[PDB]
Structure 1
């Protein structure tokens, strides 16, 4: 039926409705650190989020998204391997039922407890909808989460989750600053890939940060209390909403560092 992460509609089934799932530039992938090529010509990333305007938080039945005002160049990403300016539209997370799994990308086959995706679209295309149809339309910053110390900047997010427990619920979520979710270092790996949920379009330049951020056990616990289902439906906890690693095929992963 409609796609999800269960036994009957999970990632291994996606190709039936979305044939691009077996495509040549699908994501996520395993990042082999010994085979990644250091590229001296890659520039440092430029993250300008001082003017970010968050608007709302929504449970869409597959994750929760924090949405931003993208009507102007308020929160942008540029530099790195990118040409042009990419506007932040939303961020979401992927997490597991246990601390040993949850991330989409893996590093030398290591899985992290969760993975944050900051989604941005190329302004040359005028809107998000047109950007996903282009090979360089999206830039997604992936940040791994490990369990350790609490991340103060994540607490505002954790605390509103009760209010969007089920699918289709939304809440006003203004004045949230995404700078509170970045690691200290912006060293990264990059490769050409795709959206990791249907429609799985191959329009993403992935930028995966080397340094994970730490969250506490209690923080991640709150994510696992969300529901995949709508209100008044049988309860299905929102856990393990990650797609497994896909074949690298003809692609090279580049590193901004040695």
Structure 2
């Protein structure tokens, strides 16, 4: 049967047939043109409070892998930056390429990074994630670019569990993972209003994209590329190039927290 994905017959250019909002006015990702983004001195520093984070499980969902968190309390939250109120971390995942020259969803002056990390948070004033994705300020996604260079020590625990979730539908216990080990040194950022980048493509996201990439080693991103989109017992299709390309910016402003 048919299902959305990243192949020739079901990739991003097809998604609008199943999810018409794919051609909407607030779609993500976008290219970040650094000479059009404006420094906004009213933006606050981003406040990342992850000290009490409780990771639970890691899941291969047939499109990427999600590291899931306990979001029943304000244990891992994002405040400040462009945001009003408190946004709770629910999961993170990545998008990556088949080659080091592509894989990111956002681009910076058309530059593609090897991968992009998305830490997904929902606005606590809406009570749960499902209600938050019915609201224009329901979600905040912290996006972090990955370039290939030196290894990221805080990523290695993720890399080493991937063999146990090779195929679609597999999950593994994944407790005591500290997402602070995935941050770069600087929290300077760009921000703009956008959407989820996979179906259902809902236009609920305040994007916060960090200026500084993290470095990961070639071996680390190689292990991402050994995952499978297919389920166990089906023919192997490598999980690579699970990124949506840049979408039209339309009426939107990208702001910078730094100059």
**TM-score scaled by length of structure 2:** 0.99
Trace 1:189-204 onto structure 2 (pairs within 5 A): 189-204=190-205
Task: Name the residue aligned to 1:105.
Answer: 106
Q: What secondary structure does 1:154 align onto? A: helix
Shift of 1:183: 0.4
Shift of 1:247: 0.4
Q: How far apart, in 2, do the equivalents of 1:200 and 1:186 lie?
A: 26
Q: How far apart, in 2, do the equivalents of 1:219 and 1:3 lie?
A: 27
Report Cα offsets for 1:194-252 as digits up to 9, x if no partner. 00000000000000000000000000000000000000000000000000000000001
RMSD of aligned alpha carbons: 0.3
Shift of 1:171: 0.1
Q: What secondary structure does 1:157 align onto? A: helix
Task: Name the residue aligned to 1:35.
Answer: 36
Shift of 1:189: 0.2
- In the comparison of the two structures, how many residue pairs are matched? 258
Task: Name the residue aligned to 1:155.
Answer: 156
Task: Name the residue aligned to 1:96.
Answer: 97
Report Cα offsets for 1:56-83 as digits up to 9, x if no partner. 0000000000000000000000000100
**TM-score scaled by length of structure 1:** 1.00
Task: Name the residue aligned to 2:219.
Answer: 218
Shift of 1:93: 0.2
Q: What secondary structure does 1:28 align onto? A: coil
Report Cα offsets for 1:71-105 as digits up to 9, x if no partner. 00000000001001000000000000000000000
Report Cα offsets for 1:7-55 as digits up to 9, x if no partner. 0000000000100000000000000000001000000000000000000
Q: What secondary structure does 1:117 align onto? A: strand
Shift of 1:165: 0.1
For structure 1, the residue ranges without an aligned partner over 5 or more in a row are: none
Q: How far apart, in 1, do the equivalents of 2:155 and 2:20 lie?
A: 36
Shift of 1:256: 0.2
Q: How far apart, in 1, do the equivalents of 2:199 and 2:220 lie?
A: 28
Shift of 1:155: 0.3
Q: How far apart, in 1, do the equivalents of 2:17 and 2:105 lie?
A: 21
Q: What secondary structure does 1:40 align onto? A: coil
Report Cα offsets for 1:141-175 as digits up to 9, x if no partner. 00000000000000000000000000000000000
Q: Deviating runs (4+, > 4 A) in structure 1?
A: none
